[PDB]
């Protein structure tokens, strides 16, 4: 069985002119496509994996909420050839913002600064630092995530979906979220 094979890291890896067509190993019967879009109040980016899968055909969609960071995941598995291309005012606080940058850019005090605001009449006054991961086709993809959130006090909080996780920690004060990988409990 032939499937589209591509990986997207908030870039163009799954673009028309980067997509590969792969043939699957004996005993794998499905092609997979998994897109996880993560949304901050200043932007959105997507991880995506297309490749040979396992398991049964099906559709699995899930929306996640981590203190105001929204993630939306669509995971589709078919059984036909090349089928797996069917998806696609300031408040006081300032946060560092990573919304598509690599782990290279998104380090320390390097990322851009964003001005939080009370999106949808909810209060976004904490800063967040963590990462998003999406796993499918025996491949895993992750990027850092940074922005405003509604909680100033989370530590290694997370939400999970099918092959998908969004996790990190929160903090209080403007640009607190310089680097919270070491933050204790």
């Amino acid at each position, epitope marked *: 069985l032939e499937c589209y094979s591509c990986v997207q890291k908030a870039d163009d890896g799954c673009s028309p002119n980067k997509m590969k067509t792969v043939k699957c190993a004996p005993g794998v019967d499905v092609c997979t496509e998994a897109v996880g*879009a993560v*949304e901050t*109040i200043h932007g959105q980016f997507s991880l995506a994996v297309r490749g040979c899968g396992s398991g049964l055909p099906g559709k699995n969609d899930r*929306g996640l*909420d981590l203190h*105001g960071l*929204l993630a*939306f995941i669509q995971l589709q598995q078919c059984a036909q050839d090349r089928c797996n291309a069917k998806l696609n005012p300031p408040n006081g606080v300032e946060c560092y913002s990573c919304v598509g940058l690599s782990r290279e850019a998104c380090q320390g005090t390097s990322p851009p600064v964003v001005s939080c605001y009370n*999106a*949808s009449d909810h209060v976004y006054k904490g800063c967040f630092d963590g990462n998003v991961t999406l796993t499918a086709a025996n491949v895993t993809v992750s990027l850092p995530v940074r922005g405003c959130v509604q909680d100033e006090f989370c530590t290694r909080d997370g939400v999970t979906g099918p092959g998908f996780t969004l996790s990190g920690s929160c903090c209080q004060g403007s640009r607190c979220n310089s680097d919270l990988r070491n933050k204790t409990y």
Partner: antibody, heavy 117, light 108 residues
């Protein structure tokens, strides 16, 4: 901020219900905004059916995810719901309401649908 | 997540301090909202996140609770507070669920 539902009023069983929500005083481009559809059979409770978000993501009541498709045209300020294969159980008042992230702050007056032949 | 309202019917005299219960089978934090539907009228958002008041709502409507049990209270019932009251949970966002409703009746 207002929402106005419109619909066909009466349908026979098996037909497709097409509902339009025309809204003003806000935008479906704002992060966290969403528009949902809720119905109430007369004398009975409210049931959430579906909601569509600013970023085009759609959620459905799983008991009706096979019958439901929700969509939007942001340019005209409209959200649509169509429910295929109507039955007598789809006799209800259907409301559109705006989703501020987690709750329905603004609702329309509702459009009443009778399914009968 | 299961949501049970109680009572279903709540017969009350004008001027009393009334309370509506909404119970979750599970812990839902503060993810509960309260709606008023007067007869022949649209649902109207009353209470946000358990206890946050909505602008343009009379001050007699207040809510409370966290975790499993949640309550809506009217400090002084007026004649136009005869209505159905619905809770909705947001604990399983983007999946929303409503209660069965509490119908406020007048005693006589």
């Amino acid at each position: 901020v207002t929402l106005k539902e419109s619909g066909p009023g009466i349908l026979q069983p098996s037909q497709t219900l097409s509902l339009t929500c025309s809204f003003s005083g806000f935008s479906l481009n704002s992060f966290g905004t969403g528009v949902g559809w809720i119905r109430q059979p007369s004398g009975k409770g409210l049931e959430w059916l579906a909601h569509i978000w600013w970023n085009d993501y759609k959620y459905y009541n799983a008991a009706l995810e096979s019958r439901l498709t929700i969509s939007k045209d942001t340019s005209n300020n409209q959200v649509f719901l169509k429910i295929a294969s109507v039955d007598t159980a789809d006799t209800a008042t259907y409301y559109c309401a705006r989703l501020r992230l987690r709750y329905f702050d603004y609702w329309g007056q509702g459009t009443t649908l009778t399914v009968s032949s | 997540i299961l949501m049970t309202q109680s009572p279903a019917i709540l017969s009350v005299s004008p001027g009393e301090g009334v309370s509506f219960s909404c119970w979750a089978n599970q812990n839902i934090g503060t993810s509960i909202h309260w709606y008023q539907q007067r007869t022949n009228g649209s649902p109207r958002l009353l209470i946000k996140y358990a206890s946050e008041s909505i602008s343009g709502i009379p001050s007699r409507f207040s809510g409370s609770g966290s975790g499993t049990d949640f309550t809506l209270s009217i400090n002084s019932v007026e004649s136009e507070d005869i209505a159905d009251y619905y809770c909705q949970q947001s604990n399983s966002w983007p999946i929303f669920t409503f209660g069965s409703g509490t119908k406020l009746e007048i005693k006589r």
